[PDB]
């Protein structure tokens, strides 16, 4: 179906411990394919990227060097914009990339920033205007408008970003375009003589997007369900569980429903003693 390419970049100052660390991690969907780290001991991630030649790597490493310098300079300017002292550690994050539909056409582009965990500025969906969070970001917005930065970002997002994502999807088809369905089971643990926990498990799935819900007599138990955050297994796949506390003997009134791309249609699971 749809796919995305995204880079997640983090710059973090560390006064007294050298220049700010900068790290950029690239993903296609939920698969990391590259990492650049200013603290990397040796610069030289995914198998389908291995076929790219020296020229590809030359250009990517140069881009990383540019971003390192740009983000270190931004960190310096940001301290000024917020009247902050030179003593503390601060963080600049950015995300950017493209989403494409099944036919590989642009669905939308992304380019946004956060400073110390707070949204700072973002390129609007039109790829032509900015949304600035505060008076500091309004300065960036003024400068970026004067320098026609959005025109250049729109150019990358509509052209290069999409072109490369299509290419990665083609070369990495066997994994990137394969959905692995959840392996599911229900467990039962008494918490007392009068109540028990039913836990609905989903394991080994890709991509990460999944829906797990419990129903009682066909009604969603949103408020009573404990849902853990979807978590990586370490081997490409993801895991999740949802649990409800039920009265002893009423277990059969409860059904777990699983929706995932790798599933023809939703599963319906019950505890089977």
């Amino acid at each position: 179906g749809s796919h995305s390419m995204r880079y997640f970049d983090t710059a973090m100052s560390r006064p007294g411990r050298g220049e700010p660390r900068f790290i950029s991690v690239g993903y296609v969907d939920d698969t990391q394919f590259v990492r650049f780290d200013s603290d990397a001991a040796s610069p030289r991630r995914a198998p389908w990227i291995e076929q790219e030649g020296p020229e590809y790597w030359d250009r990517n490493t140069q881009a990383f060097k540019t971003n390192t310098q740009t983000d270190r300079e931004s960190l310096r300017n940001l301290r000024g914009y917020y009247n902050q002292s030179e003593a503390g550690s601060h963080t600049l994050q950015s995300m950017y990339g493209c989403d494409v539909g099944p036919d590989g056409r642009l669905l939308r582009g992304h380019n946004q920033y956060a400073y110390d965990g707070k949204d700072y500025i973002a390129l609007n969906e039109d790829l032509r205007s900015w949304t600035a969070a505060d008076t500091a970001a309004q300065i960036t917005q003024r400068k970026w408008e004067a320098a026609r930065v959005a025109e250049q970002d729109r150019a990358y997002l509509e052209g290069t970003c999409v072109e490369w994502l299509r290419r990665y999807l083609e070369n990495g088809k066997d994994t990137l375009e394969r959905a692995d369905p959840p392996k599911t089971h229900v467990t039962h643990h008494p918490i007392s003589d009068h109540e028990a926990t039913l836990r609905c498990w989903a394991l080994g799935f890709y991509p990460a997007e999944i829906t797990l819900t419990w129903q009682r007599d066909g009604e969603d138990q949103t408020q009573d369900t404990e849902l853990v955050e979807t978590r990586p297994a370490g081997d490409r796949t993801f895991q999740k569980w949802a649990a409800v506390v039920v009265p002893s003997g009423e277990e059969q009134r409860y059904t777990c429903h699983v929706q995932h791309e790798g599933l023809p249609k939703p599963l319906t699971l019950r505890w089977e003693p």
């Binding site: 590809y56 740009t70 600049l92």
Partner: peptide
């Protein structure tokens, strides 16, 4: 494929 971001904040 990394975007080289030439303009800072």
């Amino acid at each position: 494929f990394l975007r080289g971001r030439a303009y800072g904040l």
